[PDB]
Each structure stands twice: as structure tokens, then as C-alpha cells.
């Protein structure tokens, strides 16, 4: 009994059950629930999970406890707390906050720590649950699902500037100079007619002083839905997220996130009709937890958010911006790097379904790693992005490779030729429905900052649209000067492009340049240009057909590959760690090899320029990072040169004519 009216929540029972769950939670219970008995490790499953976590939380001083919903589900006695929290997030979350405060006080007191208890007493401990069920989509939320904790995930299109939120207002009777303090209750701060004390009683005695009042931070984030399942004929939707407190500025635009919050509906006011509300309520989603890091994708680049990390530390947002690396996982990384065929294994673990495109898969991996992001402290900078072009015959799996890269990369945008425009990329101006005032948004290139922008059907794209590519292509920034906006935007985006040679099929008769059909300025910027060729080879075609047919044997097939491939989670761990810790440097022998290769190359087919030298440098840097080395060696430069030679099929190309002999163009 004693339950809150309108809810099944009872404070005593909920507090007791949550305390029991906190004290007596073993991760082996979750592993049993998740059918992980084969994967159980009682070397760490028997220890108290949330007790140790709260000990760490006390030691560090963090004020936020990230609670997992399925953790509550697994423990039998607190199973009902799962449904109670899902249906009544507000009261239940407040109850959990109080329970965490009490249990933390008990833990500190029992261990008899010497430091004063009141110093840490005054601090609001907030619980941030997540992973509350499946996505369910968003258009399916009936109005009976108001104020229920839900799971949403999607791209972050735009974010509003921080908006102050008055919680405590300060009035002052001007004659009596008496300050006033009124709190907020459901969004209203009552105006007192008379004074709080008995000094004077007047009808209009006090005046509001806004600056004296207390303001909290609120930011509105526009998220675009990406549900797993979408009903037929439905365009992508858009829901307005609202964040508070430390979560302000946590999420940048273009971040594929997974947000948990409370569904909310609010009456809306008629235009210039004072205090008349439309019956149709407007729905928005609150925010309690944000899961930026995902194991299906690479981690966000540390270099791009390095400046924002200090501001986050100041805010203490406690959002997991970058996934942490476990020690045994680091040992596994080291042993995998110790493998002899590290290069082939990593290459083939990228897009496992694709068959016999090893040179292309390689280049993709070297792009995924990237060169050293050197910082010229005198002025200027060099970024280690590598751009790849795939001009090839039809049905060679190029679009599939682009799709896989787009899935893997943290912040990537897929684009296809005529579906793009110059203003469509970069940045533009638009009008929001809610503010009804002009704002600035981000195009595909800006949203691809710190990632890969998979540009499909390159050749079909207009010459006008391709013009803006040069700026971000060379110096990795875009500087727009248009109506109302004059600034520079850093778009450190590595462009991946797929194109069909003009004629849709490679012409052996015409040279490589004429088949590719791109201007020399744009063509030279591409570090690697892959001439994927579909040749009628009986053995290769038989093998490809056998692989594709074996893909059709069973409903949910495991991939049919002779050789073992890394898990995508482990590959993401490896790539993230290699990118963010290791920053290789060049050596004298590598320098001599680079100079010799550049000289020999520059001796019709495209003429190598200094951009070719920079591509060789960046490829050598990328290869150094792949092996986990902190320096690059001459064999890596030779490998980069070999990759450049193989991408354009230099061996099969005629030396001076530029035509390709079809007898020698055969591949594996």
C-alpha cells in the first residue's frame, strides 16, 4: 500500500528491492540470462558488480551512475522494478537516486573512511538508465505511451544554442528592497501580490529581476529517425530531443547516437492568440542517457574532438565519448599484431562477404587507419586522410564496399551523384518549424567530418557539384562565403568514391585517362585510383559463382570463406586504438625510398605530381599504423608504391601509349 496515486510504485518496496539488487547483483546472472554460460568467467562474475562500480564512482568522484535495464531484468527479485521503471520513469528514477545516495552513504560509513561525510553529502547523484527494450520505432508510439522511458537511435542533424531555463525567480519590492525566492512547480513560478514578510502590502509591490534569477541549461537537439524496421512508404521522420544539465553540447551534429529518454507531449500555443492552446499536442522526447560508442562502428576520432574533451572535462558530462580498452584486449591486440599475415587478415576482415578484391580491400583498410595528423605548430597543418576512387566495370561489388565502409565508419554520409548538390553538401540555410527563425545546418561533407563520405556514382555527378570537392579534398577544410555566412569550416573527411568508366564498361581501346574521364585537377587529388576490371576468367568466375551460391544455402547464412576473419568488434577495437594512440613518424631510409619512387614515377597516362608524393607519404604512414609501429620503414614505402602501381594496373598498362593489354590484366 501507500502507493503513489495513478502508479503501481510503492516507495518502500521499490527502495528495498533496488537496494537488494544493488547489493546482490552478479554478472553471472546476466550471462545466464543472455545464454552466455559457455562464455561465463567467474573470475570476475562472482564479485559484486554494482558495489564495485559504486566504489569506483566514489573514488573518482563522478556523480552519474549509468544503470543497465537488463541488469535489473536479470535479478529475479527486482524483475518488477524493470516494468515499474519502464512505465513510470520519473518517480522511479527519483527513488533510485535516493536509494543510490543511501547505499553510497552506507558503503562509505561501513568501510570507515576518515574523510568528513558532509563534504561529499551535498551532491546530486543521478541514475541514467539505458537499453530499455528494443527501438520499436517512433511513429508507432500511441498516445497511451506518454511519459514512458523509450529507446531511440538516429543521426543528429542539428543542435540549438544553449537556452537558459529559469528555475528560481528573484522578485523585489522596490520600496522595501526585500528579495524574493520562489521555486518552480510544473513550470510556473507564482507571482506574490503582497510581500513574503509583513513589511508592506501593495497590489503591484515587487518587480521581477531576471538577471538575479537562477537559470539552468537546456539545449534542443534535432534527431532524424533510423529505425531497424520501417513501414512501407514512410520517409525518415524527425524528433526534437531536449537535453539538460551535463548533457549540454555532449552531442555534435552528424553523430549516430542511441538516445534513451521520456516521451513527452506538450500543448502548443496559437500564433499571436494569447493563451489559447491547440488540442493536438506536440510530442517531444526527453534525454537521460546517450550511447555514442557502439561496437558495430569505429570509435570517434580523438584528434577531431581533442579540444572538446577539455570542455567536457570542465562540464563533467560523464558521457562515454570514446570506448575504453580492456587490458587483456590490449594483449590480444598485441598478439594479433605479432601475426605474420596481419596485413592479409585485416584486409579480408574488411567486408568479409566481398570475394577476391584484395588490393581494393587493402586500400580501404589503409584509408580506415589514416596517416599521421601532423600539427605544424608554427602555422598550418597536414591531415592524414586518404581518399580513394573506384572507377570500374559494372557489377564489381564497389557499391557494396562503399556500403560496408559507411556502416563501419563512425561519422559517414552516403551520397549518390544526382541526389547531391553544391549547396546540398557543405552548409546551407534553413528555417525551423519550432523557432520559425533562420538557422544554419550542415551538408554531407560537414557531417562527414572525422569520417568517410561514401560518394557513389561519381561520374554521374555534375561538374558544378564536383567543384566544391577540391577544397575539402586538398587542405581538408571548406571556406564558404555566401549570403549571410562568411567563415571557414574544417571538414576533415576522407572521400571514398565509386564511378563507372565512361561507356559504363572499360574500353580497352581508349587509355586509362579517357576511360576514367575526370579532370586532371580532380583526378590527381585522389590518392588511390582503382581500375576494377571484370574479365571473363573461367576459374575466377567459377569460384565467385560458387561463393555466391553457397551464400544462398541457408536462410541466415554464416559467411562462406576458406580463411578465418576477425570479429568486427575486435577489428573496431584495433582500428580505434591504432588511430588514437599511435602517431608514426618517417625515417631517413623511408625518405630516400619515397624520393626515389617519386623520381622514377615521373618519367597519355596521368602524370604524377607532388600530390602523388603526399599520397605515398600518407599511405606509408597508414601502413606503419596498421602494424602498430611508431616509425615507418622502407618496406612500408615500397608496399605503398606497389599498392599505387597495382591500383591503376601499371604492369598491364602500356608504357607510353597508356592503353592496357587485356592478357596481362588478369588478377587472382
Amino acid at each position: 500500500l501507500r502507493i503513489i496515486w495513478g502508479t503501481n510504485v510503492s516507495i518502500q518496496e521499490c527502495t528495498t528491492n533496488f537496494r537488494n539488487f544493488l547489493m546482490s547483483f552478479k554478472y553471472k546472472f546476466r550471462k545466464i540470462l543472455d545464454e552466455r554460460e559457455e562464455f561465463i568467467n567467474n573470475t570476475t562474475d562472482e564479485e559484486l558488480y554494482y558495489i564495485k562500480q559504486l566504489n569506483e564512482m566514489r573514488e573518482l568522484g563522478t556523480s552519474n551512475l549509468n544503470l543497465d535495464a537488463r541488469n535489473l531484468l536479470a535479478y529475479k527479485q527486482t524483475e518488477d522494478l524493470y516494468h515499474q521503471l519502464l512505465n513510470y520513469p520519473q518517480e522511479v528514477i527519483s527513488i533510485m537516486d535516493q536509494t543510490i545516495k543511501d547505499c553510497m552513504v552506507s558503503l562509505i560509513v561501513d568501510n570507515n573512511l576518515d574523510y568528513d561525510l558532509d563534504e561529499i553529502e551535498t551532491k546530486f547523484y543521478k541514475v541514467r538508465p539505458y537499453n530499455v527494450g528494443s527501438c520499436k520505432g517512433m511513429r508507432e508510439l500511441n498516445p497511451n505511451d506518454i511519459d514512458k522511458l523509450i529507446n531511440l537511435k538516429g543521426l543528429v542533424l542539428r543542435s540549438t544554442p544553449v537556452i537558459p531555463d529559469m528555475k528560481v525567480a528573484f522578485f523585489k519590492c522596490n520600496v522595501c528592497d526585500h528579495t524574493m525566492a520562489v521555486e518552480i512547480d510544473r513550470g510556473v513560478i507564482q507571482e506574490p501580490a503582497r510581500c513574503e514578510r509583513i513589511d508592506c502590502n501593495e497590489p503591484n509591490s515587487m518587480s521581477l529581476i531576471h538577471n538575479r534569477c537562477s537559470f539552468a541549461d537546456k539545449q534542443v537537439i534535432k534527431l532524424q529517425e533510423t529505425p531497424d524496421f520501417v513501414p512501407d512508404g514512410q520517409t525518415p521522420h524527425s524528433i526534437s530531443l531536449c537535453v539538460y544539465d551535463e548533457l549540454v553540447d555532449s552531442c555534435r551534429a552528424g553523430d549516430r547516437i542511441e538516445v534513451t529518454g521520456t516521451f513527452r507531449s506538450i500543448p502548443i500555443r496559437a500564433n499571436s492568440r494569447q493563451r489559447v492552446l491547440k488540442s493536438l499536442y506536440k510530442t517531444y522526447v526527453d534525454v537521460v542517457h546517450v550511447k555514442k560508442v557502439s561496437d558495430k562502428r569505429l570509435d570517434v576520432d580523438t584528434s577531431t574532438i581533442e579540444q572538446e574533451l577539455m570542455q567536457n572535462k570542465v562540464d563533467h558530462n560523464e558521457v562515454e565519448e570514446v570506448r575504453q580498452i580492456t587490458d587483456q584486449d590490449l594483449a590480444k591486440i598485441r598478439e594479433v599484431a605479432a601475426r605474420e599475415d596481419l596485413y592479409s587478415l585485416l584486409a579480408r576482415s574488411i567486408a568479409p562477404s566481398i570475394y577476391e578484391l584484395e588490393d581494393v580491400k587493402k586500400g580501404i583498410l589503409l584509408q580506415l587507419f589514416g596517416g599521421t595528423n601532423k600539427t605544424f605548430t608554427k602555422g598550418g597543418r597536414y591531415r592524414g586522410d586518404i581518399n580513394i576512387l573506384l572507377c570500374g566495370d559494372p557489377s564489381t561489388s564497389k557499391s557494396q564496399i562503399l556500403q560496408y565502409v559507411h556502416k563501419i565508419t563512425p561519422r559517414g554520409v552516403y551520397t549518390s551523384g544526382k541526389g547531391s548538390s553544391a549547396v546540398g553538401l557543405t552548409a546551407y540555410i534553413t528555417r525551423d518549424v519550432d523557432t520559425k527563425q533562420l538557422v544554419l545546418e550542415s551538408g554531407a561533407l560537414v557531417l562527414s567530418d572525422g569520417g568517410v563520405c561514401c560518394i557513389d556514382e561519381f561520374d554521374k555527378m555534375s561538374d558544378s557539384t564536383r567543384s566544391v570537392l577540391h577544397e575539402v579534398m586538398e587542405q581538408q577544410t571548406i571556406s564558404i562565403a555566401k549570403a549571410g555566412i562568411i567563415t571557414t569550416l574544417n571538414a576533415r573527411s576522407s572521400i571514398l568514391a565509386s564511378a563507372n568508366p565512361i561507356g559504363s564498361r572499360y574500353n580497352p581501346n581508349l587509355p586509362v585517362t579517357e576511360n576514367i574521364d575526370l579532370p586532371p585537377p580532380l583526378l590527381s587529388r585522389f590518392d588511390l585510383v582503382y581500375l576494377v576490371l571484370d574479365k571473363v576468367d573461367e576459374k575466377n568466375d567459377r569460384e565467385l559463382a560458387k561463393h555466391l551460391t553457397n551464400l544462398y544455402l541457408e536462410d541466415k547464412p554464416e559467411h562462406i570463406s576458406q580463411d578465418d576473419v576477425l570479429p568486427v568488434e575486435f577489428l573496431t577495437m584495433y582500428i580505434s586504438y591504432a588511430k588514437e594512440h599511435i602517431h608514426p613518424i618517417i625515417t631517413e631510409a623511408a625518405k630516400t625510398e619515397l624520393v626515389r619512387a617519386y623520381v622514377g614515377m615521373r618519367k597519355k597516362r596521368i602524370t604524377a605530381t607532388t600530390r602523388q608524393l603526399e599520397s605515398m607519404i600518407r599511405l606509408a604512414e597508414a601502413h606503419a599504423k596498421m602494424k602498430l609501429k611508431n616509425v615507418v620503414e622502407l618496406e612500408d614505402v615500397q608496399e605503398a608504391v606497389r599498392l599505387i602501381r597495382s591500383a591503376i594496373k601499371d604492369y598491364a598498362t602500356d608504357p607510353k601509349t597508356g592503353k592496357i593489354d587485356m592478357n596481362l590484366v588478369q588478377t587472382g
Partner: protein
């Protein structure tokens, strides 16, 4: 009344009055502040340069912390303290020849916070913000001290200082009125302050990855107006202030409100910045500037 405000005001007066430090190797121990009072009196200037480190060294920084954390309430107290200091020492420049509105422009603060780093907790505090000047307004007069003519018991009464919101005198030259019908301003007797609203962009180097340059509107008053150049990197020192916003009514989330007969006011605001010190980040002139 507030005891803490008056106590901090008199502590500021005392600290200014007894400010002492060695001046380099020459000039011995020079009361730089007290001497600069008459130095600026020579030209009858309107600015008093309060270097932060001076206020920070004394009282183990407690005075500086009090001023920075709650500048908005303390500022009138500091104005009264400065007037009293002028009264005690160097009273020859107080009159305009009513009284010159002396400007206390702080500078040499510890850190400069970016536009993106503006936070809702630090409003009402003192800080420095660095941005690019993109749009500037005209030098429009702003009503600071006003003269009001009472519709009833008609006369002219000045010294009804203007607040942030409109204010009119409840007391009348003829007390039998006690009515505030049509208190009318006049051009010749009201007092005004120079005003300017400058729009600033976030600097290119500090732009977050994959984000647009967030902008801000900065108010310039007094002798600091008409100092910035469009496209010139500048730093602004002052206090964060909130201004009413009529646009964010349809945004999601609950809204602040009041009840007093509905007696309800829709309460929304947007954060701006009131600035005091702004700086830009014949061959004889250039030679003179040259060391």
C-alpha cells in the same frame, strides 16, 4: 537591505584607497591606482582600469571571487564606492561640466571562454569571450537617467534613472497626485548612454568538428562603443546577461511561467553579453608604437 553587499562595497573602497605595490625599479612604491585617478582626471576620462591581479592579490582573492561570482548585484555598490573615493580624494572631476558615469572596465582575467563554452550557470559573472566581429549596429542613444512630466499635477522631475525595464516615478513634485498616468519624457533634461549591439561569430579554430559557428550578440556602452571592426578578432570582457526572447515559444520542453485574473507572463530568454573592455586581437605613429 543586504549586509554582505555593503560590507564588500566598503572593503573595495578600502582596498582601492590603500592599494600599494613596488613600481619596477624606478618610481619606488607607487599607489598606481590612486595616482592614475588624477592621471585620468587630467583628461577627465570616464574609465577606471581595474586590473584583475590587483583585486586578486588582496584578501587572498576573496574580494575578486565575490566580485566575479556576483558582479551584477555588486556593481551599483562599487559605483557608490567609487563616488565616495572621488569625494575623499580628487573630487575636482565629479561634475560633467550632471556627474560623469565612470566606467569600471575590468581586464587581465585568468581565462577566456569561447562562445561554445558559454554556460547557463555562469550568467551574472565576469569573464572574457573571444570571437570574430561580423555585424555591428548603430550608436543609438540608450535611456539611462530620465526626466518624467506627470500627467497629473504637471511639472518636470528629473533624476528618475531608467532601469532595464521602463520605470516611472511614483512620487510627484506635488504629493497630492500620487498618480502615474502619462509621465512624459523630455529631450533636453533626460540623460542617455551610448549603446551598440555587436554580433560576434565563433572563431574558426575553436569550431567543433561537424558544427556551425555559433553566434552571439554583445552590447557595448559608454566609451567602448564603435571600437570593433567587422572581421576583426576581438575579445570582450563583461557580464553575461539574459534578454527576453519571443521566438522560443514553440520549442519542446516546459516553459517558465508566473501566476498572479490569470496574472501570467510567458517567460523565455536568450543569453547575451554586456561588455566593458574590448580590444582587437604618419610613420611617426608606427615608429612611436615600435619599441
Amino acid at each position: 537591505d543586504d549586509v554582505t553587499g555593503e560590507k564588500v562595497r566598503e572593503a573595495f573602497e578600502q582596498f582601492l584607497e590603500d592599494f600599494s605595490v613596488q613600481s619596477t625599479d624606478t618610481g619606488e612604491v607607487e599607489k598606481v591606482y590612486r595616482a592614475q585617478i588624477e592621471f585620468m582626471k587630467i583628461y577627465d576620462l570616464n574609465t577606471i582600469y581595474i586590473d584583475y591581479q590587483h583585486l586578486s592579490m588582496r584578501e587572498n582573492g576573496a574580494l575578486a571571487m565575490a566580485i566575479s561570482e556576483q558582479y551584477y548585484r555588486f556593481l551599483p555598490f562599487l559605483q557608490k564606492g567609487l563616488r565616495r573615493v572621488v569625494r575623499k580624494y580628487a573630487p575636482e572631476l565629479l561634475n560633467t561640466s550632471t556627474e560623469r558615469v565612470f566606467q569600471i572596465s575590468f581586464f587581465n582575467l585568468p581565462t577566456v571562454h569561447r562562445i561554445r563554452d558559454i554556460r547557463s550557470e555562469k550568467i551574472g559573472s565576469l569573464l572574457s569571450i573571444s570571437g570574430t566581429v561580423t555585424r555591428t549596429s548603430e550608436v543609438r542613444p540608450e535611456l539611462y537617467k530620465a526626466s518624467f512630466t506627470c500627467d497629473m499635477c504637471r511639472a518636470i522631475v528629473d533624476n528618475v534613472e531608467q532601469s532595464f525595464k521602463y520605470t516611472e516615478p511614483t512620487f510627484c513634485p506635488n504629493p497630492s497626485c500620487e498618480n502615474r498616468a502619462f509621465w512624459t519624457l523630455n529631450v533636453t533634461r533626460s540623460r542617455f548612454l551610448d549603446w551598440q549591439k555587436v554580433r560576434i561569430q565563433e572563431n574558426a579554430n575553436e569550431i567543433p568538428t561537424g558544427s556551425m559557428p555559433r553566434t552571439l550578440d554583445v552590447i557595448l556602452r559608454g566609451d567602448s562603443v564603435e571600437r570593433a571592426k567587422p572581421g576583426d578578432r576581438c575579445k570582450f570582457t563583461g557580464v553575461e546577461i539574459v534578454v527576453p526572447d519571443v521566438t522560443q515559444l514553440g520549442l519542446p520542453g516546459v516553459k517558465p511561467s508566473s501566476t498572479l485574473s490569470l496574472g501570467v507572463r510567458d517567460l523565455t530568454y536568450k543569453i547575451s553579453f554586456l561588455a566593458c573592455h574590448v580590444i582587437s586581437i604618419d610613420q611617426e605613429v608606427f615608429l612611436n608604437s615600435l619599441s
